[PDB]
Amino acid sequence: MPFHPVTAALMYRGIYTVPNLLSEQRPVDIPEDELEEIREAFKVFDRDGNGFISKQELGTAMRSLGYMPNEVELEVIIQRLDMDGDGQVDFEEFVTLLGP
Ligand SMILES: [Ca+2]
Ligand SMILES: [Ca+2]
């Protein structure tokens, strides 16, 4: 058997090589090529690079898009992502809300 993950569970003998090309054929799913964009974005704004983004740091991210938040606003925006309550936002928390 090939080390290749997932090959074909069906197909007894009398069959070309097509499994389900009459239903969907080509699969629909954005390649991780888009995921790497998630990091480089908010991750670079992390001046400490500790892997977490604080309020003062996140305040530099929003302004970049064209939304400059005040010292009073960047506080309520960070609590929207920070569900665990660590003062900073973790990759995962932001990676899920970035997708379906
Ligand atoms: Ca930081
Ligand atoms: Ca958090």
Curated annotation (Swiss-Prot):
Residues involved in Ca(2+) 1 binding: D46, D48, N50, E57
Sequence ranges assigned to domain EF-hand in this UniProt record: 33-68, 69-100
Binding site residues for Ca(2+) 2: D82, D84, D86, Q88, E93
Location of this chain's protein in the cell: Golgi apparatus, trans-Golgi network membrane; Cytoplasm, Perinuclear region; Cell membrane
Domain text: The C-terminal transmembrane domain (TMD) is necessary and sufficient for membrane targeting.
Role of this protein: Negatively regulates Golgi-to-plasma membrane trafficking by interacting with PI4KB and inhibiting its activity.
Subunit structure of this chain's protein: Interacts with PI4KB. This binding competes with FREQ/NCS1 binding in a calcium-dependent manner.
Protein's recorded name: Calcium-binding protein 7
Organism: Homo sapiens
